């Protein structure tokens, strides 16, 4: 009895973790190729 | 690291005059954390013992925890105590006559340092 | 006459059931003024030792400061301590079997009286 | 069950460097309830004694209450004290040379736990 808890506010109830309805994706890169490509006769692709 | 600790502490000091009898020195609450009991003899006794112990508020539940003969004139209980219905610290002197070798009456002083049952929560 | 003194004091009491293992009894802050550590055995052990000492919150810095064999059943550390990163009072029982001679399990109670690192200035 | 108890307690900690001289460690008020005096030697002395005792603020009323030779390096007064005009706890080292066996200077730490003269009334 009454030993050191070592517990955190994590495993303390009354808190009630809330989770973000919004997801943010791990995609940001944009390769240049869409600028190269085109219907023109002189485009690189 | 988190715990509950006793944050309130009291010291009770009481004198009696070292001759045969029973004295109710210190009153303790239920759940008190008795952490020091010290008995001191002021003067030069010639014969007798002092026994301090615990007893009930009413009924005859006396049991010595520290016995002091004449010679050493000072003592401290070697043990720590949580008060469980034995809410009187008491001292009895079974053998004693007049002061002896001094002409001035012999005193006994008991100091009880105890922590109150209340607890608070602290993390370090 | 003027000085700085510690004005805040706590008592931590913790029980364990006296069989082989390591227990983290009392947590102390840095700069705490540990002035009394007392260990008590409630019951009649038959074989074993209890070693109380200091260790880190995480790493394996255990070092016994008070060893108690079966017979005396009570002890107090003879030394006073300022907490310097050794912020766990811990107790280990290396030898112990079931209660023995009683049928009722053997308890160990540790009481730690310590003063908080805070100071105030007083002149008398 | 009703009594008056001391509800205020202080701890005074003071260091000196363990060589011949007299040091005024702790100041106490009149009516203070001195319940613990502890002396500690940090280091490895080679020769000398430390005597702690009580003395007046001004006049030469020094009287040792605890003597510490080299070997044990720690001590606690066996007696409890009510401050009656002896309002200085003092320590003197009569024999001491340089640190010895270490190369690092030898420290002495004195901790005085005492209760203030104020009382409050409590019934349990």
């Amino acid at each position: 009895l009454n030993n050191i808890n070592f517990n955190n506010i994590s495993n303390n109830p009354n808190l009630g973790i809330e989770v973000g309805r919004e997801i943010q994706n791990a995609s940001w890169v944009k390769s240049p190729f869409f600028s190269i490509t085109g219907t023109g006769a002189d485009r690189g692709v | 690291m988190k715990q509950k600790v006793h944050s309130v502490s009291y010291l009770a000091k009481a004198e009696f005059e070292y001759k045969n009898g029973v004295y109710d020195l210190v009153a303790l609450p239920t759940g008190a954390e008795v952490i020091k009991i010290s008995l001191e003899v002021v003067g030069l006794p010639t014969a007798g013992h002092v026994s301090v112990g615990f007893k009930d508020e009413s009924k005859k539940n006396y049991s010595s925890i520290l016995t002091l003969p004449v010679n050493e004139t000072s003592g401290v209980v070697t043990k720590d105590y949580t008060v469980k219905s034995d809410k009187i610290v008491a001292a009895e002197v079974k053998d004693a006559l007049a002061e002896g070798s001094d002409g001035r009456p012999v005193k006994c002083v008991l100091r009880a340092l105890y922590f109150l049952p209340s607890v608070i929560e602290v993390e370090y």
Side-chain angles (χ1 to χ4, degrees), chain A, chain B:
Chain A
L1 192 86
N2 196 50
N3 294 41
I4 310 159
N5 289 118
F6 292 109
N7 300 327
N8 290 318
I9 201 160
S10 59
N11 52 5
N12 169 257
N14 311 274
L15 270 299
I17 297 169
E18 65 183 1
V19 189
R21 167 59 93 160
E22 69 276 16
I23 318 292
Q24 69 275 16
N25 63 7
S27 55
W28 59 277
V29 176
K30 297 206 273 211
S31 291
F33 295 97
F34 82 92
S35 61
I36 293 186
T37 69
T39 73
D42 63 358
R43 307 303 300 267
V45 169
Chain B
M1 290 186 353
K2 172 176 45 171
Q3 215 172 47
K4 305 206 206 287
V5 290
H6 305 291
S7 65
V8 179
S9 165
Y10 291 160
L11 184 77
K13 180 178 99 80
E15 305 77 16
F16 56 110
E17 10 172 356
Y18 189 47
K19 33 169 162 30
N20 297 1
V22 257
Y23 314 85
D24 315 91
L25 282 284
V26 182
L28 308 157
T30 34
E33 256 338 327
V34 164
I35 60 171
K36 184 161 161 70
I37 302 296
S38 80
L39 185 68
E40 182 191 295
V41 179
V42 177
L44 278 311
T46 58
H49 294 39
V50 184
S51 77
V52 308
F54 279 89
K55 69 180 277 279
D56 236 9
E57 199 276 330
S58 73
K59 66 159 207 58
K60 260 337 138 179
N61 194 5
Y62 183 91
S63 78
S64 177
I65 61 171
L66 183 92
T67 276
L68 247 123
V70 177
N71 49 4
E72 78 275 26
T73 76
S74 175
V76 153
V77 303
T78 59
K79 184 149 191 36
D80 287 283
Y81 289 161
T82 280
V83 175
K84 297 204 234 259
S85 66
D86 287 325
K87 300 181 34 177
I88 300 300
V89 182
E92 119 203 353
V93 188
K94 34 186 161 303
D95 185 24
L97 53 138
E99 54 335 33
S101 76
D102 295 351
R104 28 182 21 164
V106 176
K107 220 169 87 178
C108 297
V109 159
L110 187 134
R111 299 171 179 88
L113 160 71
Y114 65 90
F115 265 83
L116 276 298
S118 166
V119 291
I120 60 167
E121 171 195 348
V122 294
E123 68 232 10
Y124 301 163

